[model samples]
Target: HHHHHHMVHITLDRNTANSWLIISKDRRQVRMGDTHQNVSDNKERFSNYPMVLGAQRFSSGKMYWEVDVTQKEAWDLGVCRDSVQRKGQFSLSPENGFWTIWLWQDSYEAGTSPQTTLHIQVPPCQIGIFVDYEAGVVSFYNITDHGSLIYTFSECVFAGPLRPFFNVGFNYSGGNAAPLKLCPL
Candidate 1:
């Protein structure tokens, strides 16, 4: 397909989320569960977590997707290797196979080994993720008048497949209770 802003479909794999998160019936949005439901712990799931993984796998191609961050005071977005570890608390870094970016406390940070903080004047209401497995490039963009580059992991090596990963941080009891939506065309 030609490179278009509105292309590629991605759905959340609720099984990967912790019991504390709520996956929409359509599996397009993820948010903190209203109440503590009996969620099981498994290898594919983020034990003791509220993280969600994508249902699609990308081995090679220019995959483009978007996330709606409106009303979300705290959230994380990006892609991760297929073999990335789940379960337990860990730092979301490139070294850990997580090339994600997060927005919290009105600040933006790239999930680099040391973590790169950003000074974005406007909150990225519509977050965009782009990945090219063959070229080993994963980029984040702020979809606007023109695509704005947030961060790009270049000269990277893909050990395996990649998929969209997300974590709606800031507890549900807090102000960030909005669902992390996978924008539809």
Candidate 2:
């Protein structure tokens, strides 16, 4: 449908997650844990961010993945550099080597240089991600329409392997409890 973009099943890498985050028994869903069990590792775990990386790394080719974000109040979706400092509020700009989209309350934002505004107005329940590593492009799609473009980050420079990243929300206890479910192919 979208240039033969093959679907890729993605799972959350627990090693790259904060202990307060909970991965589903199936390893395809990630939600905010009810308890505050912080992770200690500074290398693999996200020190200051509330996110986890995809277990698989992508260095070349075009890949597609879908996310079922029904009822999720806040979240971020996109690809991030392997070397991005796993600390602090994760920036979604080229300055920090991250190309992402954000959904917070009633606002939808594209994490770009200066962080551009997304015109979708309302966030879609089902979202899709498509990346062209060699072309330095990553596009977000509103899959509810089968083919609706949300936002695209072009001239995305990469170092080597890039991991799909996810974040439920900022530091909020029992606020955004919905899990960011990874859609199965």
Candidate 3:
């Protein structure tokens, strides 16, 4: 348990989810939906991409959470500042207030200033995130491989409260249709 007491029960914020995202009623899971639903009448809602943010806010100290990606082929997960761009065409990078890693085109990469390509020896079926706000650190772990350290983004500047970020994988050959589930604490 990496600070089990700090582990947050993240509930996906529907107000920040895109119209094509199907967030579970329990708010623990999210996936891509075929039919575009009615847009959320909120500034936090995403308009140009399929993404969502957790409602749990972290302003200081360390926070941890786990997500089950399973067989999903393409997806992005990490933390973002509360004021991150929610509408229009936005890119995933720390410059854009996003500290995330994504799986795309069968490759893993970090959302850094110059995207860092990760070479994963063992793909993680489930992933864990640890945020040390005071230390300005954000680390990702592979839960499937007995909590192996995957990547760490250090020296992050958190201007305000940070929220867990999630991007539903695209529907490519039905390989990424599986829902991204937030593991219960």
Candidate 4:
């Protein structure tokens, strides 16, 4: 019910990673790669988006995780339903099974129905994602700013298990080549 109470060790699920993404050997970091590797095709693999999911699945519980996104120009961090669309272009909204917030260039936005634009004075170097399954609430925090609230998606209707979502974003001219790391315990 509070910060750090349910913090979990999250690792990127290799099976769900897009071929364009290079997950670290420890499975704690992910970044976009230039060449697509010869990875096996699977139903859970992302075909279009450069995204991946955490290995752990939450069905009914409160859990939290933190990600290190320092120096990253573009990225996404949050949770998504297990059955979320993985093959094509879909809106990153709760209605589409994603509860997330993203940083594009210097602006931040909440992935809501209409997508709320967030004006943050101090961009977070580290981000925390907290999910309450039974309560149907997902909240994001700016851990770099004394754990300040960034955004929250409430009254969600979670039909099934939820997986931690991570999008390395695009490697625009090698600008966003820094890896999104899972913070150490």
- Candidate achieving the largest TM-score: 4
What TM-score fits each model?
0.91, 0.91, 0.95, 0.96
Q: Write the per-residue lDDT of candidate 4 for residues 1-185, one digit (tens) a residue.
A: 26688989998999999988888899999999888888879898988888999999999988988999999899988999999998988889988999999998689999987989986788899998999888999999888888889888899988889999999998865788999999976
C-alpha-based local distance difference test score of model 4: 0.90
Worst 10 residues of 1 by lDDT: 1-10
Q: In model 2, how large is the Cα lDDT of residue 167?
A: 86
Candidate 1's displacement at residue 57, Å, is 0.7
For model 2, what is the alpha-carbon lDDT of residue 82?
Answer: 86
Better of 1 and 3 by TM-score: 3
Worst 10 residues of 2 by lDDT: 168-177
Best of the candidates, lDDT: 4
Which candidate, 1 or 4, has the higher TM-score?
4
The RMSD (Cα, Å) of candidate 3 is 1.4
Q: Could you tell me the TM-score of candidate 2?
A: 0.91
Candidate 2 lDDT over residue span 14-83, tens digit each: 8899878889877899888777666566578886767889998999999999888887778999998888
Clashing residue pairs in candidate 3 (N, C-alpha, C atoms within 3 angstroms): none
**How accurate locally, in lDDT, is each candidate?**
0.81, 0.82, 0.89, 0.90
Q: List RMSD in Å for every model shown.
A: 2.2, 2.0, 1.4, 1.2
